[PDB]
Protein: Glutamate receptor 2
Amino acid sequence: KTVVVTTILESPYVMMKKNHEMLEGNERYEGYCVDLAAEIAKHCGFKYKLTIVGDGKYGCRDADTKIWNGMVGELVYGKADIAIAPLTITLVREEVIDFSKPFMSLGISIMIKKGTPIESAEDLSKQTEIAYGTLDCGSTKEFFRRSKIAVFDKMWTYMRSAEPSVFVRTTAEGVARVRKSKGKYAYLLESTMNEYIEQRKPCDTMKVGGNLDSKGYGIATPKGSSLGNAVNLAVLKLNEQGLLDKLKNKWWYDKGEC
Amino acid sequence: KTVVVTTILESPYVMMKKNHEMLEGNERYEGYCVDLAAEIAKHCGFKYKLTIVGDGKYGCRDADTKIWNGMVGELVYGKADIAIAPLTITLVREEVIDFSKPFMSLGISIMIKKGTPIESAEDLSKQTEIAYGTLDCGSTKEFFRRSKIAVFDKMWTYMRSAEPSVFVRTTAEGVARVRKSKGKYAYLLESTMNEYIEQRKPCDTMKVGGNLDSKGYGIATPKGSSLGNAVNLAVLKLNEQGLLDKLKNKWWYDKGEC
Ligand SMILES: N#Cc1cc2c(cc1[N+](=O)[O-])=NC(=O)C(=O)N=2
Ligand SMILES: N#Cc1cc2c(cc1[N+](=O)[O-])=NC(=O)C(=O)N=2
Ligand SMILES: [Zn+2]
Ligand SMILES: [Zn+2]
Ligand SMILES: [Zn+2]
Structure:
């Protein structure tokens, strides 16, 4: 009867509310996906519980065992009914789960510490002094893994073997790394996070260049789930009513600090 | 056996080859959606025949009779198997046909003749001198019809009563009307077409402001088609391999004239 929603702690999508302690259930959390979850549930008429994904991951597939982890895993194995999170629509995922039409558009981007003499991907590919990486389990890593485009393959060859690892477990960790590495680390990540962070104290990073690709976050359900159809039309109604844009403005730019 | 593809003659998606008279079948046509149709069909393993939608329209539903016209109609009524065209993914269409994930991202935008003193939608809504309108059957008109946002509703109230009519039958007619009206008509259309026209002679138009919304074009199938799933995976594969961005560059910018 109550729908189990899997999501991930990633700012400004899902964050613990300051007084989160004196709060219970769904009320402990706030952010873009908390608001979206409430709207989706209202329009589709279900009650829900927000659960934070147990391994802290979006999801990737073990090369050997072929087992999915992260939010994708929770869906595939039936531990959650829906993922309301910034979950990137990719081919490998669509093969095992269903996605709504995108609620947010995005692309891979480059984050630098301000003053770093690095303006595009080509710039990173052609030098060494400045290290760079990506999230360890996710869509951006796979993009570089499977790229034939020459600048991106060069970056891949450098990235995979780099020592110590240029890969980070969580986004927060990559952001933290840029900020503390004195311009000797650049982070490849989704444009959404990049834009959010550039407007957060201490205002010491910047997005550079355009996006390397174009894609979308969708709301995900297990393959063949009845919820899929209503959720998809629900996302469309919200986009067309301007609510998704209102929410983006609310969580990125209205409380912008720079 | 051969899949019937409905499409629309809209540059640079589908155009008659200069010497199409001396050609047959699919070889009469060229463009972004011609190149994409060939790839979708090869990746899904079907033969196909390109056909141009009989009424020249994307698709809207008659208020009185509730009948769908344009490419949406051809799918609803069984006259085509698939629409490979720049068909906007919207709630009202999704209610009657299926769409793949977006093969292109876009939003409604403002086209002006160079020098017109307009920067934004708010600017248009606060005057009178400069008339403005949209395509008469399609998703941009419906956006304004159904928008509860003050600026856009104010625009709709003006457009829906303006005389002579500010609506246009075809995109081409709208572009021509900007170009000939000496700064006294601005046209609201999809950003893809705005961007295309800005790079064609006589180089007298430009896109101003940001997009008013964010949406996608999808490949459409009748509900229940067997092709939906394969077509979807094909679009995601082609995006991830970089083909969609290469195709956009070929048809918009590689041959740009400005
Ligand atoms: N926001 C966000 C993000 C959302 C993500 C992500 C990386 C980021 N990021 O840190 O930039 N990788 C993923 O595979 C994903 O499904 N969703
Ligand atoms: N390009 C293009 C276009 C594609 C469109 C369109 C208008 C334009 N336009 O002229 O901007 N209206 C639609 O309802 C649609 O499904 N697809
Ligand atoms: Zn605590
Ligand atoms: Zn609502
Ligand atoms: Zn001819």
User: Anything to note?
Assistant: Chain B has ten helices and twelve strands. The domain at 1-106+216-255 of chain B is CATH 3.40.190.10 (D-Maltodextrin-Binding Protein; domain 2). The longest strand of chain B covers residues 215-222.
